[PDB]
Amino acid sequence: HMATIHPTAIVDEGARIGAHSRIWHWVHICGGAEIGEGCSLGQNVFVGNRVRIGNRVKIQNNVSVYDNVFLEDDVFCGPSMVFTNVYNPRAAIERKSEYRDTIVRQGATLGANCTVVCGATIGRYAFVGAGAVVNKDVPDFALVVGVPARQIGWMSRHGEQLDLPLRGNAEATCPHTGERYILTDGVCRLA
Amino acid sequence: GHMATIHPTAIVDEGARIGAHSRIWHWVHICGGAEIGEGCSLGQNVFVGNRVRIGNRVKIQNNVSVYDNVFLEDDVFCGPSMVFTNVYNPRAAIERKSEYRDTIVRQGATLGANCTVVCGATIGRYAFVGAGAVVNKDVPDFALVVGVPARQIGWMSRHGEQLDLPLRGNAEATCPHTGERYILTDGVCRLA
Amino acid sequence: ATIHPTAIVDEGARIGAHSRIWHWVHICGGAEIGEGCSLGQNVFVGNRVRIGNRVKIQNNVSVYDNVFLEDDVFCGPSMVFTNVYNPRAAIERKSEYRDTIVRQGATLGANCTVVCGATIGRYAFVGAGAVVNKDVPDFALVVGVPARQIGWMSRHGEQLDLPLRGNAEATCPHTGERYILTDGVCRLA
Ligand SMILES: CC(C)(COP(=O)(O)OP(=O)(O)OC[C@H]1O[C@@H](n2cnc3c(N)ncnc32)[C@H](O)[C@@H]1OP(=O)(O)O)[C@@H](O)C(=O)NCCC(=O)NCCS
Ligand SMILES: CC(C)(COP(=O)(O)OP(=O)(O)OC[C@H]1O[C@@H](n2cnc3c(N)ncnc32)[C@H](O)[C@@H]1OP(=O)(O)O)[C@@H](O)C(=O)NCCC(=O)NCCS
Ligand SMILES: CC(C)(COP(=O)(O)OP(=O)(O)OC[C@H]1O[C@@H](n2cnc3c(N)ncnc32)[C@H](O)[C@@H]1OP(=O)(O)O)[C@@H](O)C(=O)NCCC(=O)NCCS
């Protein structure tokens, strides 16, 4: 049941990778990293030391999970999406002491080639469209697109838009499962 | 010296079909189901899935992952770190391997550096997707599209320069490099 | 320079003291890299490339032929350079490369893209994800697709209290250094 690791991958002494996880070609994981069970890390992923990745997190090719990135259970990182840890980098000024956290909450989907400016929290089951640039917190269930990203709707856990306004108070059901969502002052939650 | 073939660091899985005179560079991984034509170039860290067909003289720059259900015709150009997809609405907790949508890129299309194509879109012959655009709808033959999301702003000749053609209606234009004539018919561009 | 054993640095490449080359980097034999640089995972460097001193290049950056990086340039993770403006696979355009010159202290944010031909000014700052397709003035802060200027960044890397255009003066509070905006061009006084 131990994690399976491609022979071309480099997992540095000390790293913790949970059962049933799968680590693919030319992945490098630093020794501080903690990765849960049933994760998948695609070709050329990088993982830093100051990183916690939960269970069943699927990370596509070419994603660098840097120090100060935290991924909850069931997060999806699409191909070539990009995390950061310094807000205002300058090569002349080492900013390793100024890292900002990026927290991605359970079930959030980070679309292909999106970018997340450090300091943002991405809420539970949020959905960041392909290519978006996130530079503010993303509410639970929010669908955001564009550069920079702006909220255009709400996404059910299953991954389809809810017939719910952005603002105010309202209720709606998932078009697939029928489960109910409540909007209260512009914040969406599961009933 | 000798012509480069397949860099020794590449991994080409048993079964892959690669045409003559193609060049596969450092730390490329090609899956066993893939078919790749003649005269192609695959840059550093390319990935190619199993359910993939790539034509002839397809030039793929570094860091492009040609996933299952992407199909590239002859003379397609994939710019550095452009991005294909195959699931429209991914959720880690919901496996969607039976829900892949095709991305078909027709002959001569150019996909600019760091663009992204949302699966399901078809990219027309000799289309031109500007650097960093995000394509989420079909792109007509010859269309020049830019932006997030991508919008059509012009028409690009086979040579790769804008044609003096309006976006809609009927019109004609000539490429000054080749003298090739183009006809627009109710907003659809073709070579004469 | 210190070079990870998985990196491939082709014979002829010049790499200065105190530089660090990380996992599965490939550097071509014509490249010139200065002192105190850092090249992250899977970086690629072409032959017709000059990279100055103390240039920090994060993972997944391809520094292609005709890209020139001055000292103290920062290239963020997965940012993207180009060298052909209008590529077509059928038409080899290796003779038509356009230069991309990135001047001293400029920062290229994560996952930005620079269309070849642009010059990026000294201490400019290209926001994460921007697509640059025009020259970026010294100290300009630009964001968006395509990139548009929204302010001015000090060397330290925080916005200066200057109008977007016009004539004005400002001081960096971290260093006390003075900036002068003359006819929309910012400089150190
Ligand atoms: C967000 C997404 C799921 C579409 O959701 P949807 O509910 O079907 O939304 P629609 O297509 O109706 O689009 C709604 C609006 O948002 C815009 N939009 C949708 N996705 C967008 C994106 N990624 N970037 C910018 N705008 C986008 C649409 O253009 C439309 O606006 P318009 O009418 O002004 O043109 C899809 O576009 C997307 O980004 N998928 C991600 C695919 C991916 O990253 N997969 C990775 C795994 S392989
Ligand atoms: C599209 C491209 C070829 C320019 O074509 P062009 O016919 O010269 O067009 P122009 O530069 O006149 O631009 C026309 C409009 O489109 C905009 N535009 C052009 N390219 C754009 C891009 N990639 N993204 C967003 N907008 C863009 C321009 O800003 C201009 O708009 P504006 O007048 O409102 O500012 C070029 O910008 C590009 O994207 N090249 C791709 C380079 C590449 O990917 N190379 C990879 C191989 S190394
Ligand atoms: C540019 C940046 C430094 C913010 O600078 P700032 O002076 O704090 O600017 P603000 O956040 O006040 O933003 C000012 C405006 O520009 C917009 N903006 C800021 N950064 C943006 C970006 N990258 N793309 C698009 N828009 C952006 C903001 O949304 C705001 O406009 P709005 O009011 O319409 O929303 C930051 O967003 C950024 O891009 N950092 C780069 C991180 C990176 O690449 N790190 C790499 C090393 S790990």
Ligand SMILES: CC(=O)N[C@H]1[C@@H](OP(=O)(O)OP(=O)(O)OC[C@H]2O[C@@H](n3ccc(=O)[nH]c3=O)[C@H](O)[C@@H]2O)O[C@H](C(=O)O)[C@@H](O)[C@@H]1N
């Ligand atoms: C990766 C990281 O967090 N980078 C931040 C950092 O940059 P940098 O150029 O100094 O790099 P870097 O820490 O040396 O690592 C470079 C590469 O070496 C590899 N690397 C490095 C160390 C290690 O122990 N293992 C390893 O694999 C691994 O491949 C790694 O990617 O400081 C910058 C800053 O000051 O603003 C921040 O903006 C950056 N986000």
Ligand SMILES: CC(=O)N[C@H]1[C@@H](OP(=O)(O)OP(=O)(O)OC[C@H]2O[C@@H](n3ccc(=O)[nH]c3=O)[C@H](O)[C@@H]2O)O[C@H](C(=O)O)[C@@H](O)[C@@H]1N
């Ligand atoms: C690659 C791919 O098509 N991913 C889709 C997929 O995700 P995932 O995390 O389950 O991955 P994955 O199939 O295990 O392959 C991961 C990596 O392992 C390597 N890989 C994998 C298998 C193989 O035979 N060879 C190989 O190299 C190779 O490097 C590969 O990149 O299911 C998602 C979903 O359900 O929504 C879809 O959104 C994703 N687009």
Ligand SMILES: CC(=O)N[C@H]1[C@@H](OP(=O)(O)OP(=O)(O)OC[C@H]2O[C@@H](n3ccc(=O)[nH]c3=O)[C@H](O)[C@@H]2O)O[C@H](C(=O)O)[C@@H](O)[C@@H]1N
């Ligand atoms: C990389 C580069 O500058 N590409 C430009 C080029 O495309 P292309 O497909 O012909 O490639 P390429 O020169 O064969 O190199 C491909 C890969 O082989 C590797 N490579 C290649 C040669 C070499 O000596 N060493 C090496 O590592 C290395 O990994 C390299 O990335 O001609 C196009 C064009 O005509 O418009 C331009 O738009 C492209 N910007």
Ligand code: NA
């Ligand atoms: Na990218």
